[PDB]
Design a protein around this ligand. Sequence first.
Ligand SMILES: OC[C@@H]1CC2(CCCC2)CN1c1ncnc2[nH]ccc12
Length: 167
Amino acid sequence: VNSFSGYLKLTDNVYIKNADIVEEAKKVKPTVVVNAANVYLKHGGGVAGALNKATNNAMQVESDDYIATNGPLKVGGSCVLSGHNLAKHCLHVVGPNVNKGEDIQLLKSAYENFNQHEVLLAPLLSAGIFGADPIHSLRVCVDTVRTNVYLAVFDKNLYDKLVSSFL
Ligand SMILES: OC[C@@H]1CC2(CCCC2)CN1c1ncnc2[nH]ccc12
């Protein structure tokens, strides 16, 4: 039993809500919040910019030190950093940017990172500026993640569309 509230159950292990992941994190303070990152951990907009703003830029400061030491992430890859005031940990996950010609097959690799954590609060990956089909991303999530994932989807029209569709 956990403290997530108002989620619609999609499968044994996947749940979804029309919500801002930032607000869900502040309310729930989960063990792991997932960031929809880029390989440089430059948190400008969308999920990443919003999470970073909520940490008063501490996420960006920590991320810049990570990159200076380790170099960029791989598309499809991830790293675990602090969750700051939002969660214990933040799992920064890079989905493919379809608008940059990156292989959509890497979306499955991106979601595989979630399986290293028993419970996660997460966004849908590769949407927004990355330009992947959100219905496809949800199907990949459901067909790839085996651990317990709570998906917070910002756009009301997007949420209504996703929960009224057969995956
Ligand atoms: O789940 C992925 C969705 C998809 C969006 C890009 C196009 C429509 C919206 C951004 N995003 C978010 N989801 C949950 N919390 C969020 N907080 C700030 C952004 C955000």
